[PDB]
């Protein structure tokens, strides 16, 4: 999901937006400040959180060798859901 700056130009995923008083914007005139529509902020939150029944899980990122290097994440903190830093998808204990 992409928002729109008050000046009428779409904001990028990093949140950068050209100021209305800025002079370097004119590079966008007769051109476009194209923005990747698939926001990584909005492309990972809706992925389901898994419910594996184990203390420690190896996350590979899918595809085996094609995924990120295997990382042994931990699921003991009941308030927080475990996650792999490489991928960002969620992991969770079986409701304990």
């Amino acid at each position: 999901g992409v928002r729109t700056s008050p000046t009428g130009e779409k904001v990028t995923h990093t949140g950068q937006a050209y100021d209305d008083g800025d002079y370097r914007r004119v590079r966008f005139s007769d051109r476009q400040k194209e923005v990747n529509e698939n926001f990584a902020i909005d492309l990972i939150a809706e992925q389901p959180v898994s419910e594996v029944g184990s203390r420690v899980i190896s996350c590979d990122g899918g595809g085996g060798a094609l995924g990120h290097p295997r990382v042994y994440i931990n699921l003991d903190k009941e308030t927080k859901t475990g996650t792999c830093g490489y991928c960002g998808l969620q992991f969770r204990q079986p409701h304990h």
């Binding site: 990028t12 050209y18 590079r27 476009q32 698939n38």
Partner: peptide, 26 residues
């Protein structure tokens, strides 16, 4: 998969749809 383009495009150079470099940092 979800994110792949539905309409493959060509070199937009010369056309108004051409890319422009810009700061991606705040």
């Amino acid at each position: 998969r979800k994110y792949i383009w539905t309409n493959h495009k060509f070199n937009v150079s010369g056309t108004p749809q051409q890319y422009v470099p810009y700061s991606t940092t705040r």
